[model samples]
Target chain A: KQPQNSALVVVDVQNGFTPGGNLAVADADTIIPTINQLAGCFENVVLTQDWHPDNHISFAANHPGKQPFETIELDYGSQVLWPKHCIQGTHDAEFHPDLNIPTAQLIIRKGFHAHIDSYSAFMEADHTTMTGLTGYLKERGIDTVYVVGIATDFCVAWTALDAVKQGFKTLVIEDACKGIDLNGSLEQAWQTMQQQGVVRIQSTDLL
Target chain B: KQPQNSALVVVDVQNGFTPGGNLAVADADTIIPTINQLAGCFENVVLTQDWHPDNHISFAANHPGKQPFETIELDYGSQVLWPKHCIQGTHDAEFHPDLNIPTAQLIIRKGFHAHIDSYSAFMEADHTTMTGLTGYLKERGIDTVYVVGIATDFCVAWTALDAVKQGFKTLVIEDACKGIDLNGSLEQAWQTMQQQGVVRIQSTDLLN
Candidate 1:
């Protein structure tokens, strides 16, 4: 059920995670039209961008001896070093050109802290702090959040799971999402969400 | 790192969730030795027994129209109506005889509240109140917890996760665990534990 005060959370549809762009989500080009259509149906649309500094700790190049996907402990928490990508002010950090999200009321720039990585648009990896999202949503009287976007396993999964932990009735639109299945993590992500009572719905189910 | 002082938490080793018993873990007989070894190693051993009455709300038989595994809204929170097992004074409610827990300092009997289910040994499903575990452990200067027992995915997982939330360094001995695998819940259980920094180690890892 769509709560009357529901909001659509569009997570990480940036250039780095979209096809034909650097470090893109594979086949992300196909979902832009579907996401745009979904955004049009909602009253509130919030977009998240992976806005990281040039030498973000997650970037493999920053840690000279570390390889991508290797885990390292930072002050914020344990961070998985990622490929060199999504640096702010770079073209790869911009939203996909095909995504016509002009109605985005709030654009949350995450991964701002070089020491810690922010996967969910709402919180950092440490889980204690917020990303200024809960206050913003509360101010707007948003009670339920409908999440849709790339990598159903990672960013989208974390956002939906965190939304539930923050006491929101959360739903993940599966059709409008994709995932980088590192070590069967995509399946694991779905299981995690389902166990936490995050409802999985197809884009068509919403209609 | 293990905390300065730790207690050994043996959860749900009762007959209900074990093999040849009323409600057994899919393969409850396999991990007895591992669980025994874990319990034997620690000085502070606390066991949790799921002592439910015959008409406990968590039991599927108690709900007139609902069947086992069906989700139902209860007064405490959402609860899965379980199969009729772990009834007090029943054979399935007794601790496994094979368990070498000769000196259990404390035995907490949970799920006694007819209205609620107690998945976590430290807390009920609602999570507002505790099972008196935190204060008990704190009073004993126990800050870390080595948890072992049946059904890795459900009871064990919930206890370990809640232990972390309750400010304990939790370690789950994987070899001493079994899971029912109800709809691929084991994978999520492991992911939740790992994400929350609960160490999943084998019994061998504790040798050193």
Candidate 2:
């Protein structure tokens, strides 16, 4: 059942979005083993990193009178401002040490624009801006994507959504991702994803 | 003090977002006079149009089981699907008859890509894709922009936000931009714009 046209999209899974790191989501690193196992099932793997410059626009510190989790409008749309995390070349931006995916052939670093935030590996927050993930996967003959990684409600969910929009058969391995669950965003993320035809599966389904 | 580097950005003053149109926001056309007056004061004026293809992904009809006003996730982020309007070459896509900016130097047609939508005159819905508006303004020595036109909450707000991000001093003429006010989006838009340093103004401020 391993489809050559499928790729496992390991999203974020970075030190900044993991437990014991800046802006860590609770227990986020716990899912690394499941993601690693799922990664073994795919012939192709793509890794996404939240590589941001020190003055990235999504940082709450960059804006006066704004706090982390407060939503602000950007050139793209509403953006949830975040505490500084994953500054480029910092240890906080590195992939989690436990994520053992040697087969990942591509590393797509997103949110590089000083002014735009990218939650999805495929698209930036502005939605019209692409990260080249779609073209990369499509050119590689991969039309199906299984998304797994940190902060299921945000990065994982956004990548899955973007994957489906790019005409890929998309799935989210729920058990292999953790969520920040900001004000029930976790539940809402799943609801919106399912409505968009993203299949939600536990890691066991792939294992 | 009118800055020589300043430009007036008119966003989507189209029939589609006006009364008697498919996706009309309430009273969107009523601000045309203000926009026209403001246009007279500027040496440079740029207009934006929502020139979408028939199969534009933002159209609610294009997505099965989705209704207008319902939100969906697009590659760029969350998009609110809308009833089809402003298709290319349609009357609905034309500028509102009341919108009389005769001196307008550039008309940036956007949202023509069937897969992506453009809410900002400067950028596509995917924030990364530029509409060439930034480069156009910059090359013309324009550094400040005052935005006016239909659906204040969506297009005007987006354009203003982008103008600021592109290093222009951005302003929104409140009275010349009507809003759809979808579920407090209007209030949210203003708050967001202000936070991003988009100045809010009235026609009187510019006219005086």
Candidate 3:
């Protein structure tokens, strides 16, 4: 009966985060093989993507005189503006070619609102808007989650934090993630995750 | 191809509502075999129970000078107070003995609030509190509902009304339900359903 109480949460493995793509995480491609390996190990697997609209408020191009990586204030809260990527039905929004998990029962797409951003699969940037992942997991009776994917600093880290808030035993597979580490964001995110009791384990430790 | 748009909803088919039981409806058990026969015809199936706690507000005994079949006003609207039945973990709340759809995915327990009673499978007696069945059905992409069960005038009628309001194509099978008419209430409920665009059909429509 010790099935780890775990579900694999693959976050934002879009082509936009892979090598040679816009806003690419350096060596993000290398982590896919690790994620694919762990995907088959869990009884439940879910995939999330950063599905954005073209006129999205988080895009730097939408804000006059602002460049990518700049911060802006929205009606909800502070938002980190980024380069235009993952615009609806586009090549950048598609999952990575080498990342293998087609059998995921649910595919959650966030970041579609023009006035808000969503880094966490569970919540929007407003923090009150839900993407419906928590309900799906709770309905399926999943208590623990194993997270892996690109950009440990942003989408993946934020999702792990929310998985804990939703009463899930959250863990992050270290090598299966590539961090942007933008201006100490990665370290700060890790500290917050640790304080919140999210465990950091390697894929080898899972088996 | 897309799956069938409708799902089967079993409502209040509990021991308390069956023959010789608490708040029993006449001939309620006879409809069980027909419901069991029709339950397999849907791609998705869910069941609802009129689960109440002891000291529940809807119980007639809880209100002094009030007997069963009494009408009282509630904050949301008028409430038809019921007898003490389906109290939580008691056998009265269990599904009836011969009702055989073990494959149902969800069992929604309603009217658990001490201050309110729920007759609609989707909303509490206040009519504002949701049971989350709407979101669950929407997420599964089922756009229509076929409803059957006990005491059709109260629970079945309200549930069918809400199913249409939630934009699901709603239908009620006539011979598959037993209603406590309570003075012309049964005919009134059917007329309202017809006006609300809820279809009236028979179990043979699905079987054939």
Candidate 4:
């Protein structure tokens, strides 16, 4: 149902998630044109930015000897620290200009809170706190949500699962999203999302 | 086409703008059920709140000689000063309990800028500082936006205008929306919106 109220969420398609940025997802830039083409068909578009302040707790540098990909416990739960990327006002945090869908009505900036790490577009790692996305979807009257963008195993996967839990009929545009698997994480994320009722489709399916 | 990329924005349906609050809109509460039912039919719903600081510059209380509703000049443009309402963390700013969309995905809190006023959900009154709604919609692939909320002439109108300018195919869900028709501002805003290509349709157009 390509109804007027459906939306496609372009997740963290920023320099930081692409090659040449600190946390580059391999070939993450490959999906931009596909996403651009897909985004044009939708009536509502939203983008999520992984905006963060300097000294954010998720940075491995803050932990001194801790290396990126290492885990730590925080007030919220187990947290995976990463190399500093997507810091506010930096080139790394910007959307890849070629993604082109400027008609986006809302941009949900997430991971800005220093104390929390956010992977889900809807919930901060703290879980209790929200990024306000749940309410955004409902208010817009969007019944179906389509997903695309960087690192399939992390942000994209988590966001799709959250979308289903929050009552959205969710789909992952598989080829339209790439992943930095980080071992088996990408495979695992797919299993988890499918278990939670997220549909998987490729860009060609929509075409 | 159920394009999987459209949304509804419910603007300022708070205690302060409803029945008994400081800047209440007549029959504003009446649209709650309509909005609620329409909300259920969508997967992407968002809310915009008029949360303001106590000493917000828009409040006439901040301007000793300015009475509520009096016009004032600001760096942005002409402005209408308002009675103090929707003070942050107060009951007046809370969403009406009857707005039953528990599955909403985002809540954009606007008008927190102490020096500037906010009417359009896309930008603050200065017309420069953004509320991030435009970027938010674009990123989600939202090209069509439906608006419902209080003060149709003010918040709803300006938001739809900004939405269209930002390149979204914007609409005002008339029957599902309530308006505060202050001095023919309601009709005036509609003309401006129509001139800009913002469609006005009733909720039935979709539901039926």
> Candidate 4 on B1-208: residue-level lDDT in tens?
2354789899888999999989998899999999988876775678888878788999999997899988889888888888999886688988898888754656677777689888888867887766667755665667788999987889899989989887888989997777777678878998999999999999888787
> Could you tell me the lDDT of residue B50 within candidate 4?
86
Q: Report each candidate's C-alpha RMSD, comma-separated, in the order given.
A: 20.6, 19.3, 15.5, 16.5
Interface RMSD of each: 23.6, 17.9, 12.4, 11.8
Tens digits of lDDT, candidate 1, B79-117: 877889888657888788787664454556677666777
Could you tell me the interface RMSD of model 1? 23.6
* Sliding window of 10 residues with minimal summed lDDT for model 1 chain A: A101-110
Give the DockQ ranking, best first.
4, 3, 2, 1
Question: B-chain TM-score, every candidate?
Answer: 0.94, 0.97, 0.96, 0.97
CA lDDT of each candidate?
Answer: 0.78, 0.84, 0.82, 0.83
Stretches of candidate 2 above 4 Å error? A1-207
DockQ of 1: 0.01
Better of 2 and 4 by lDDT: 2
lDDT of 3 by residue, A84-121 (tens): 88776678987889977633544567786677788998
| Comparison by DockQ, 1 against 3, better one | 3
lDDT of 2 by residue, B23-103 (tens): 988778788888888888986677778878789899999999999999999878999999998987688987888877644
Two-chain DockQ for model 4: 0.03
- Clashing residue pair totals per candidate (backbone < 3 A): 5, 7, 0, 69
Compose the digit string of candidate 2's lDDT tens values, residues A1-207: 478788898889999998878899988889998888887788677778888888899999999999999999877779899999988668998889898764454556778778888889877888776655676566557789999988899999999998888899999999898999888999999999999999999988888
- Residue pairs clashing in model 1 are A17-A25, B16-B23, B17-B24, B17-B25, B18-B24
Q: Please compute DockQ, using alpha carbons, for every candidate against the native two-chain complex.
A: 0.01, 0.01, 0.03, 0.03
User: What TM-score does model 4 score on chain A?
Assistant: 0.97
